[PDB]
Amino acid sequence: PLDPRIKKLLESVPIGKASVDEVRKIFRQLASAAPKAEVRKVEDIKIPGSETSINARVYFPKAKGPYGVLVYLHGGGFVIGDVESYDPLCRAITNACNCVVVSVDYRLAPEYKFPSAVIDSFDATNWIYNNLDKFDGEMGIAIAGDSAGGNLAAVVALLSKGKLDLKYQILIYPAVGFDSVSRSMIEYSDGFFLTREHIEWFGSQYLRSPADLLDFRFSPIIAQDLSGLPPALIITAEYDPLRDQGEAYANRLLQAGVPVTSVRFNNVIEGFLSFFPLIDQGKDAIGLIGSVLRRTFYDKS
Amino acid sequence: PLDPRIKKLLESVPIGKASVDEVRKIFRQLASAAPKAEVRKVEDIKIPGSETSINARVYFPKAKGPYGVLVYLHGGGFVIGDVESYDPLCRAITNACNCVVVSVDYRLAPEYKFPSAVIDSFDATNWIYNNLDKFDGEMGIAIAGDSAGGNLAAVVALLSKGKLDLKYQILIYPAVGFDSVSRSMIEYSDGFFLTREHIEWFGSQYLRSPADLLDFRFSPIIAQDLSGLPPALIITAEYDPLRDQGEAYANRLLQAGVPVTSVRFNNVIEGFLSFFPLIDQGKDAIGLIGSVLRRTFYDKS
Numbered sequence: 089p090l091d092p093r094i095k096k097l098l099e100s101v102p103i104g105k106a107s108v109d110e111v112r113k114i115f116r117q118l119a120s121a122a123p124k125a126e127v128r129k130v131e132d133i134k135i136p137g138s139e140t141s142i143n144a145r146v147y148f149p150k151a152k153g154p155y156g157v158l159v160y161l162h163g164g165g166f167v168i169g170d171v172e173s174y175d176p177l178c179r180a181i182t183n184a185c186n187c188v189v190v191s192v193d194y195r196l197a198p199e200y201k202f203p204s205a206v207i208d209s210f211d212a213t214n215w216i217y218n219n220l221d222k223f224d225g226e227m228g229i230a231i232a233g234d235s236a237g238g239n240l241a242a243v244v245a246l247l248s249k250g251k252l253d254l255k256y257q258i259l260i261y262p263a264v265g266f267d268s269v270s271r272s273m274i275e276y277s278d279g280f281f282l283t284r285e286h287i288e289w290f291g292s293q294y295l296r297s298p299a300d301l302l303d304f305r306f307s308p309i310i311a312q313d314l315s316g317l318p319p320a321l322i323i324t325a326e327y328d329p330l331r332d333q334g335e336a337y338a339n340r341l342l343q344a345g346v347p348v349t350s351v352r353f354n355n356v357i358e359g360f361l362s363f364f365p366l367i368d369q370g371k372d373a374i375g376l377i378g379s380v381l382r383r384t385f386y387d388k389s
Numbered sequence: 390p391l392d393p394r395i396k397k398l399l400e401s402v403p404i405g406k407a408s409v410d411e412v413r414k415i416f417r418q419l420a421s422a423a424p425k426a427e428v429r430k431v432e433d434i435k436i437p438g439s440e441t442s443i444n445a446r447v448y449f450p451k452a453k454g455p456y457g458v459l460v461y462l463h464g465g466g467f468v469i470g471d472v473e474s475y476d477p478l479c480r481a482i483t484n485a486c487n488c489v490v491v492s493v494d495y496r497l498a499p500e501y502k503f504p505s506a507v508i509d510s511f512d513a514t515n516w517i518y519n520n521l522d523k524f525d526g527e528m529g530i531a532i533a534g535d536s537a538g539g540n541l542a543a544v545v546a547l548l549s550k551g552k553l554d555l556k557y558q559i560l561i562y563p564a565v566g567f568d569s570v571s572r573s574m575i576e577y578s579d580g581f582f583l584t585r586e587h588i589e590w591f592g593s594q595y596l597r598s599p600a601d602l603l604d605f606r607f608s609p610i611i612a613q614d615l616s617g618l619p620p621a622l623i624i625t626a627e628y629d630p631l632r633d634q635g636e637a638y639a640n641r642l643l644q645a646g647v648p649v650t651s652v653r654f655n656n657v658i659e660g661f662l663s664f665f666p667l668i669d670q671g672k673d674a675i676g677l678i679g680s681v682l683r684r685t686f687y688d689k690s
């Protein structure tokens with residue numbers, strides 16, 4: 089069952105039942121309420137994308153350089169969330185990994201439909217790779233994201249094959265495409281914070297037509313060739329409609345010869361890292377991310 | 390684990406690794422080896438379809454009329470199987486249900502691509518409904534099929550809304566559309582008679598393009614409205630890549646207010662009803678089908 093702590097929270101975001109502005113506001117207040125751990129320096133920058141000027145926030149750790157750079161893509165169903173609501177989580181990650189984190193404000197739906205978020209996410213990653221020197225970031229680049237952001241991170245890793253050299257991909261309860269059949273999707277369709285009704289609404293805002301469901305930049309799990317992608321850490325949550333599809337993607341990567349550490353956090357729900365001050369398991373997931381990135385960037389414990 | 394009987398069989402059909410003719414031959418010899426239980430009368434007929442003359446075999450039970458009529462759509466990945474290979478199973482079903490069974494030779498891929506099988510299956514069902522008197526079949530019509538045939542049966546039930554009155558749908562380890570993510574699909578991808586490599590090959594023969602994956606006549610589980618469909622008996626197998634998607638469809642029907650009895654036969658594989666002389670559980674599944682149809686057609690135990 090759910091951790092009693094989480095059950096108590098759920099019993100005590102109205103996607104599709106309030107205006108876009110109102111749902112965005114509600115999420116901002118939930119996510120940004122978490123404590124902001126001190127980092128060494130924070131800078132807001134503008135990345136020149138192919139289609140837009142992309143805002144991003146750069147977090148520097150207290151540890152001395154040189155650093156690896158983690159590009160972070162926030163979740164929120166391609167519609168809600170932003171860099172500022174994810175500030176507490178990105179600070180926590182910065183401190184865990186002793187690395188630079190660059191959180192990207194990719195274009196959101198409904199204002200900008202698919203593939204806008206993908207284009208911005210890839211363009212940002214490409215620019216950061218080519219400008220690692222600006223961050224004393226010569227130990228390399230990795231990509232991470234949660235939920236919709238995990239989708240984007242997985243897709244960026246695909247698009248980066250033969251263009252950039254990503255060291256790692258961190259997929260935090262990722263969405264990996266169209267799923268009408270998995271047990272977790274059916275079973276945890278209602279009552280676990282992210283619902284099927286929400287999922288459907290997000291999809292209706294982001295995608296242009298059903299054909300986009302079959303585009304690998306939405307459904308990376310149908311990509312022709314997953315071989316040669318960066319090693320992955322894939323975190324899933326036991327009581328999450330997206331659980332089975334995340335674990336499916338892990339299995340497909342493994343079958344393609346890509347190293348994958350796939351870990352299911354039991355007793356928790358989608359979004360649990362955003363709730364780290366309340367949900368202890370969220371702190372431990374952040375710590376696991378830290379371990380993996382300190383090893384890949386620095387060869388450190 | 391698998392029933393040891395089945396493990397022993399598997400250890401002792403080369404889809405995609407032999408010619409279409411050769412795979413068809415191999416399946417014919419496996420399936421048609423089962424005993425042919427006596428029925429009262431067998432007749433071959435021709436049904437005038439919208440696009441072709443459709444061959445079908447009619448089995449009459451020893452019980453006296455009047456009868457219900459079960460339209461049966463064989464499996465084989467839309468490529469293999471035929472009425473004659475399914476003769477032993479259809480005879481077994483006839484005797485279990487005390488009803489008329491009409492087994493349909495729908496057009497097969499690669500010679501005829503999607504939606505040919507669907508068109509023939511629906512046309513046959515429509516003609517039988519309108520000609521029940523020819524079979525002393527006034528107790529009504531139901532639809533059934535296994536695997537690819539379960540797909541067709543589910544789709545026929547959808548297409549029949551507002552056109553015909555089906556009493557029941559029997560979906561025997563059905564395929565219900567595109568699935569890149571379910572646990573059963575991933576876990577039982579290899580070594581359980583039907584494999585993912587097979588599934589992919591069948592799909593490549595039947596579908597015209599990826600867009601067909603999103604057509605409700607291939608993926609009934611994405612249909613807009615499942616309400617008002619006939620009551621269902623859905624049989625799944627524990628060690629079957631299609632298991633989770635069949636159970637998903639059951640859940641979606643239930644949520645739409647359609648009566649569903651969803652039963653997972655443990656310890657067995659896809660196709661187990663075709664192996665009834667060896668696999669006892671297959672005989673018991675046939676018996677369950679019998680119970681449900683004697684009740685719906687005759688209000689009998």
Ligand SMILES: CCCCCCCCO[C@@H]1O[C@H](CO)[C@@H](O)[C@H](O)[C@H]1O
Pocket residue numbers: 164165166235236263265266267287288289290291292293294295296297298301
């Ligand atoms: C957590 C965020 C993941 C969102 C996944 C969306 C799954 C696909 O969303 C679907 O696609 C179609 C295209 O708009 C629409 O017809 C439907 O609204 C929706 O069911």
Ligand SMILES: CCCCCCCCO[C@@H]1O[C@H](CO)[C@@H](O)[C@H](O)[C@H]1O
Pocket residue numbers: 465466467536537564566567568588589590591592593594595596597598599602
């Ligand atoms: C047991 C029979 C069920 C067959 C299910 C097929 C699942 C979809 O099949 C897919 O669709 C595409 C269209 O041809 C192809 O690109 C691929 O071959 C295949 O993966």
